[PDB]
């Protein structure tokens, strides 16, 4: 009958990336995690100990614990109509620092600056982001660039 073991349906998920099998490079072990850090979760199939269940592949959570060979990650998972808190013991091989945050940290650190650069000068800042605006007017010149007239082309077969 049906079958639904732990690593069920994961053939291509935990698979290894073309011409990237073998030892994991040492940078994966030199990276350093602190409680609060935001991490993305993705399984290294060659590292059977400490694997995320496949539900958590592609998922991003927060470190809550740092352990000898691992980090404890809390993921919010929705079951029924509600989220429940989930805690994952993952070896450092199945985790990386998420950049889901840099645009923020980089933007903060920058936002402080142009605020100083304003204040100190005599204000007028405006530092919220804004959506793509529509385009302004413009004058396109014809010089070197007279318009080429095209028409639709007849039916033809090649074969």
Partner 1 sequence: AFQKDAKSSAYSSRFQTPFRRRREGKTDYYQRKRLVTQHKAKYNTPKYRLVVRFTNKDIICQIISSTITGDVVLAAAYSHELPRYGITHGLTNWAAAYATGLLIARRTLQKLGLDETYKGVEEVEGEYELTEAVEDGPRPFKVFLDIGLQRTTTGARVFGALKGASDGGLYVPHSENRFPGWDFETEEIDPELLRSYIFGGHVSQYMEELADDDEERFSELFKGYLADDIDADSLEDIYTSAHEAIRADPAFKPTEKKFTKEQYAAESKKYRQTKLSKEERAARVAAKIAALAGQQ
Partner 2 sequence: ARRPARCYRYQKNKPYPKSRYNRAVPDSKIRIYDLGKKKATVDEFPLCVHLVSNELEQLSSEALEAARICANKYMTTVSGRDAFHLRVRVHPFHVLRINKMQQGMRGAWGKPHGLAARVDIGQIIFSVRTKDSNKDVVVEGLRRARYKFPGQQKIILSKKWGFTNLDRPEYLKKREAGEVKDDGAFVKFLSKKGSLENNIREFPEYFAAQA
Partner 3 sequence: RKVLQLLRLTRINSGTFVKVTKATLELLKLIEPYVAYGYPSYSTIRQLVYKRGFGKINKQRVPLSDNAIIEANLGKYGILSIDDLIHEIITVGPHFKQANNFLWPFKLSNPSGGWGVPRKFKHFIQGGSFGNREEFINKLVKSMN
Partner RNA sequence: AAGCUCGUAUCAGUUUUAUGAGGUAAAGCGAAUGAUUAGAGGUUCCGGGGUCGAAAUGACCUUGACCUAUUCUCAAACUUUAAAUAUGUAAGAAGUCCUUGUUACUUAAUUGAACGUGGACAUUUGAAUGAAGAGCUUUUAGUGGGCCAUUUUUGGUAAGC
Partner RNA sequence: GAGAACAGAAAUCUCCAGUAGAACAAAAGGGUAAAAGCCCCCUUGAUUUUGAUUUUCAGUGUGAAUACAAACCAUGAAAGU
Partner RNA sequence: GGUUGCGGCCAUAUCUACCAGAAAGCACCGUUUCCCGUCCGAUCAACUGUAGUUAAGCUGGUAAGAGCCUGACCGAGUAGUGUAGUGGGUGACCAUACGCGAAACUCAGGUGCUGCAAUCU
Give residues in contact with partner 2 (CB under 8 A). Answer: 157-159
User: Contact region for partner 3 (CB under 8 A) — 17-25, 38-46, 130-138, 146-154?
Assistant: 130-138
114 binds RNA, rule: CB under 7 A: no
Residue 95 CB burial class (10 angstroms; 0-12, 13-18, ≥19): buried
Half-sphere exposure of 64 toward its Cβ, with a 13 Å CA cutoff? 11
Query: Which of partner 1, RNA, Mg ion, none has residue 129 at its interface (CB below 5 to 8 Å by kind)?
Result: RNA
Query: Which of partner 3, RNA, partner 1, none has residue 31 at its interface (CB below 5 to 8 Å by kind)?
Result: partner 1
Q: Round to the nearest angstrom and report the end-to-end CA distance of the chain.
A: 51
Instruction: Please check whether residue 99 is in contact with residue 37, taking contact to mean a CB–CB distance below 8 angstroms.
Output: no
148 binds partner 3, rule: CB under 8 A: no
Query: Which of partner 1, partner 3, RNA, none has residue 95 at its interface (CB below 5 to 8 Å by kind)?
Result: none
């Amino acid at each position: 009958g049906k079958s639904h073991g732990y690593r069920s349906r994961t053939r291509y998920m935990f698979q290894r990336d073309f011409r990237k099998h073998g030892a994991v490079h040492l940078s994966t072990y030199l990276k350093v995690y602190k409680v609060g850090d935001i991490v993305d979760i993705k399984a290294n199939g060659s590292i059977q100990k400490g694997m995320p269940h496949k539900f958590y592949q592609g998922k991003t959570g927060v470190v809550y614990n740092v352990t000898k060979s691992s980090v404890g990650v809390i993921i919010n998972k929705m079951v029924g109509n509600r989220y429940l808190e989930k805690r994952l013991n993952l070896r450092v091989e199945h985790i990386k620092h998420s950049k889901c945050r840099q645009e923020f940290l980089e933007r903060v650190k920058a936002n402080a600056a142009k605020r100083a650069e304003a204040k100190a000068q005599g204000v007028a800042v405006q530092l919220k982001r804004q959506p793509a605006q529509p385009r302004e007017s413009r004058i396109v010149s014809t010089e070197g660039n007279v318009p080429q007239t095209l028409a639709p082309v007849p039916y033809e077969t090649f074969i």
